[PDB]
Every structure is written in structure tokens, then in C-alpha cells.
Design an enzyme around this catalytic site. Structure first.
Site, PDB file in Angstrom:
ATOM      1  N   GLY A 221      14.846  13.817 -32.295  1.00  0.00           N
ATOM      2  CA  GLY A 221      14.046  14.384 -33.465  1.00  0.00           C
ATOM      3  C   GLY A 221      14.664  14.318 -34.870  1.00  0.00           C
ATOM      4  O   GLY A 221      14.192  14.790 -35.709  1.00  0.00           O
TER       5      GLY A 221
ATOM      6  N   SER B 202      11.953  21.412 -29.805  1.00  0.00           N
ATOM      7  CA  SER B 202      10.959  22.265 -29.089  1.00  0.00           C
ATOM      8  C   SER B 202      11.787  23.611 -28.118  1.00  0.00           C
ATOM      9  O   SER B 202      11.313  24.541 -28.063  1.00  0.00           O
ATOM     10  CB  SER B 202       9.966  21.518 -28.312  1.00  0.00           C
ATOM     11  OG  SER B 202      10.270  20.925 -27.219  1.00  0.00           O
TER      12      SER B 202
ATOM     13  N   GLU C 229      23.389  19.033 -36.707  1.00  0.00           N
ATOM     14  CA  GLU C 229      23.677  19.721 -35.050  1.00  0.00           C
ATOM     15  C   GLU C 229      25.034  19.358 -34.720  1.00  0.00           C
ATOM     16  O   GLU C 229      25.703  20.233 -34.177  1.00  0.00           O
ATOM     17  CB  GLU C 229      22.771  18.888 -33.876  1.00  0.00           C
ATOM     18  CG  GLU C 229      21.370  19.321 -34.301  1.00  0.00           C
ATOM     19  CD  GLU C 229      20.431  18.432 -33.392  1.00  0.00           C
ATOM     20  OE1 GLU C 229      20.808  17.364 -32.861  1.00  0.00           O
ATOM     21  OE2 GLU C 229      19.261  18.638 -33.343  1.00  0.00           O
TER      22      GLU C 229
ATOM     23  N   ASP D 156      21.474  24.957 -28.465  1.00  0.00           N
ATOM     24  CA  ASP D 156      20.632  23.670 -28.757  1.00  0.00           C
ATOM     25  C   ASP D 156      20.394  22.852 -27.483  1.00  0.00           C
ATOM     26  O   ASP D 156      20.825  23.053 -26.318  1.00  0.00           O
ATOM     27  CB  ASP D 156      21.592  22.908 -29.644  1.00  0.00           C
ATOM     28  CG  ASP D 156      20.810  21.857 -30.453  1.00  0.00           C
ATOM     29  OD1 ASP D 156      19.676  21.737 -30.521  1.00  0.00           O
ATOM     30  OD2 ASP D 156      21.303  20.939 -31.352  1.00  0.00           O
TER      31      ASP D 156
ATOM     32  N   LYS E 110      21.888  13.185 -28.263  1.00  0.00           N
ATOM     33  CA  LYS E 110      21.100  14.218 -29.010  1.00  0.00           C
ATOM     34  C   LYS E 110      20.412  13.341 -30.363  1.00  0.00           C
ATOM     35  O   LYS E 110      21.170  12.236 -30.777  1.00  0.00           O
ATOM     36  CB  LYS E 110      21.928  15.219 -29.498  1.00  0.00           C
ATOM     37  CG  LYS E 110      22.219  16.317 -28.467  1.00  0.00           C
ATOM     38  CD  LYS E 110      23.084  17.347 -28.850  1.00  0.00           C
ATOM     39  CE  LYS E 110      22.362  18.346 -30.041  1.00  0.00           C
ATOM     40  NZ  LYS E 110      21.076  18.587 -29.901  1.00  0.00           N
TER      41      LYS E 110
HETATM   42  K   LIG Z   1      17.338  16.198 -32.707  1.00  0.00           K
END
Ligand SMILES: [K+]
Ligand SMILES: [K+]
Lengths: 231, 231
Positions: A102, A35, A108, A86, A99
Site C-alpha cells: 500500500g 487495514s 515504515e 505493523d 511490505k
Molecule cells: K504499506
């Protein structure tokens, strides 16, 4: 009074300004997931003509980038990236991050590995004295699920297999499962990342510590703070 | 005069004898992959009633085990393994191995991680002064193919994307590609394994060094030698 959503817009806008201040015209931008990253995508869209396009860290991000008419390049076509922008589930004082909450852990970390500068965008809630209260994602080969679980349990971790709404195992893009590990108190993220990376069956660990944030644009109730960490 | 196939039968039989000498009745046996491992499977089949079954390191091995009526357990059902019996593409004096030439890198390394004792079975050709003349398999996430390639090239490695007979990329069980890296002279396998494991986008590296062979049954033209390495 700023809500969390408003703080996320604030850091997304701040990161767009960082990119236009620091990344020359024609560049390809590395783009995160979540988000907060979506706020940055929307802000970057307003200056999209200045850049050739983006490398994306997820299906969801690719979709949002394309919804703005931003060209998305496969990372294999790209030799280098100046910046990768990020979020983080948590970030500590060294710039080490958890991290993957999600799910996009692996891509990433790949895009982050190519970029010279990792710009973390986060609201103030993400900055913690010690990583681990947000569960640590570990992407694992399915046949190694219990072997890795046992190794995490030996550290006092409580491993929880990630599930979909229907209670079948979440499965990632590479046909892998995720263990979200609770109860770890990660006082040495670099050392724990190295240890978990040495475990056969681990695909990616959601500790970004050996390569953490280079800077963080932190949205606080008194505005954006710029935090910087050792190269 | 013993051909290579005859030396492989010889070490397969020797490993079956090692298992019956050292692994109690009722045990589950960890089973490798490849032509040498297949000789061990055929030899173990003759004493299969002494053991509850096997954990397998590949589809091909599962198929061969079942062709002998040996029960195959999913590793997730198994808490521990005393032994894992597998080949190596190369093995050095420290017991560090290159493995993965026939593709089953990741599951071999997972099963090997659970077993207390890694028994390497190899003909004499596999024992080398320094690892690396056999190309090093690196299983990689596809979006990281060129990023990992560049990192290997910076070490002087010549990375070759593994291809099928039809020249499309070989893709593993987890939807991943393999880079076979030539021209490396791996004088410190543990250090290089640690380095490659730290690269985002690497799934598994076919260096078994942090966990190498505990012993090797080496089939030579003068019979089987038993080599032992430091716990
Ligand atoms: K993530
Ligand atoms: K293999």
C-alpha cells in the site's frame, strides 16, 4: 468461521493487549500502515490515555490516529521507541517480511529501524514458506527506473511500474516511483535485501529482513498464535 | 606553476582525449558534475559532432551541456554507457571516492552504475591516503534525519545538516536533506558504504566504493598521471 476482517480485528486487539502488557505508561507507540494496522489503531484508541502518543508510518495512519485524538510526534523529536506495530504483505519462517503493498514502504522501514521490537500483526494468509509471490515493492529514483528494472530482470524478476487509477505512475511522498517485482523466489531475504540496497537509485526495498519481525501475532481460524523470531 | 583551475582544465582536456581515443563515434557519453567536470564538458564540446549526445548527472550539467548544443538523453532511454567522466571530492588508493559535495550525489551514482568505465578527473589535491577529511555526504529522507545522525554519531561522525545561504535545510531534487559527516576515518570504504546503505532512511551515501573509479586522470604540477584500479 472468521472472515479475514474478523481475523484482522482479532490481531489488532491482541497487539493493543501486547502494548498494555509490555509498554509502560507514558510511552510513545510506533504505528504501522494498512487495514490490519488500522484495527490496531482502533483498539489502541480505547487505552490512548495510557500513552503520550504515537509515531506514524504514513499520512493515512496520521489521519486515523488524529481521528481518535491521539497525539502524533515527528520521529525526529523521538530518541527511541520500544515497539513498532505493523502488518506485512508476507512473512516467512525467519520473520522476514515483504511490505510496501500500500505504498508506505520507506517510512515504515524508518520507524521500524528505531523501534527495539517489531510486532507484526497479520492474518494467517500472510505466513508463507518463501517470500516473493506477493510482488516486492522497490521504491526508486525516477531516473533509475529502467536501470533497476534491468537489474531485477537479470534475476528473473518481472518489474511492474506502479500506476494510479488513471495509469500515470504512482509517485511517493519523496517524488519517487515504485516497481513491484513479481516472480522472485526469495529463499535468502537478508542476502537479496543487501544486494538491492547496494543499487544506486534504490531508495527503499520492501524486504524487512536484516531487521524483520521480533514477533508476529497471527490471526488464525483457531485464534491468535504468537510467533517469535531470533533477536 | 599551475593553479588548481589550470590543473582542472588539464584533466578535462585529458578526459576528452581519453573519450576520443576509446569511445567510438556515435556513442552517448556519461557526464559528471562540478567545476572539474565542467572543464571536461567544455573540452568535449570541441568534438561534440563525433557523439550522439550525453547522459547528465545534474541540472547544472544538463544546462552546461545544452549551452554547447549537446543533446541530453534521459537515462531511462539508454540501455548502456561505455564511459562516465566525473570528479571526486576525494579518491584513495583503491579508487574509492567521496562525492556529493556539490549535491548531485544520487544521480552521479545512478549514471556511474550504468557505465562500464568510471573515469575520475581530479587535480592532485583530491588523492588522499584515507577517505573522510572531506565531509561525507549522506542524502536522507527528512523523517530519518536524526535517526541516521545518531547512527553516524555512534561511529564518531559529526553530522552537519546541509543548509542554504539563508540557513534553511538544503533540499535535493527528490525532496531530501543531506547530512555532511565530518571526522570519519574511512579505512574500509566498501564496508562502510554497505553498512550505511543498510540504514532505512538513507537514500544515497556519497561513498563510491563498491563501484569506484576504474581510472583517474590526476592533474599534478608535473602533468597528468593515469591511475588505474582493479576491475
Ligand atoms: K504499506
Ligand atoms: K557533486
Amino acid at each position: 468461521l472468521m472472515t479475514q476482517d474478523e481475523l484482522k480485528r482479532l490481531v489488532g486487539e491482541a497487539a493493543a493487549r501486547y502494548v498494555t502488557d509490555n509498554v509502560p505508561q507514558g510511552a510513545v507507540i510506533g504505528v504501522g500502515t494498512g487495514s490490519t494496522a488500522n484495527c490496531f489503531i482502533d483498539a489502541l484508541a480505547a487505552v490512548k490515555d495510557r500513552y503520550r502518543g504515537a509515531v506514524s508510518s504514513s499520512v493515512a495512519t496520521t489521519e486515523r490516529l488524529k481521528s481518535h485524538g491521539i497525539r502524533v510526534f515527528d520521529l525526529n523529536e523521538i530518541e527511541s521507541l520500544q515497539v513498532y506495530v505493523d502488518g506485512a504483505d508476507e512473512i516467512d519462517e525467519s520473520g522476514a517480511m515483504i511490505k510496501g503493498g500500500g505504498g508506505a514502504l520507506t517510512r515504515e522501514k524508518i520507524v521500524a529501524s528505531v523501534a527495539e521490537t517489531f510486532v507484526c500483526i497479520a492474518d494467517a494468509s500472510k505466513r508463507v514458506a518463501m517470500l516473493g509471490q506477493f510482488p516486492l515493492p522497490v521504491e526508486v529514483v525516477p531516473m533509475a527506473r529502467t536501470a533497476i528494472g534491468r537489474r531485477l530482470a537479470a534475476l528473473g524478476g518481472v518489474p511492474v511500474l506502479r500506476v494510479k487509477q488513471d495509469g500515470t505512475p504512482y509517485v511517493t511522498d519523496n517524488g519517487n516511483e515504485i516497481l513491484d517485482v513479481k516472480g522472485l523466489r526469495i529463499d535468502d531475504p537478508r542476502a537479496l535485501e543487501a544486494a538491492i540496497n547496494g543499487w544506486p537509485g534504490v531508495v527503499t526495498v520492501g524486504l524487512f529482513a536484516q531487521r524483520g519481525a521480533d514477533l508476529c501475532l497471527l490471526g488464525t481460524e483457531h485464534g491468535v498464535e504468537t510467533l517469535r523470531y531470533a533477536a
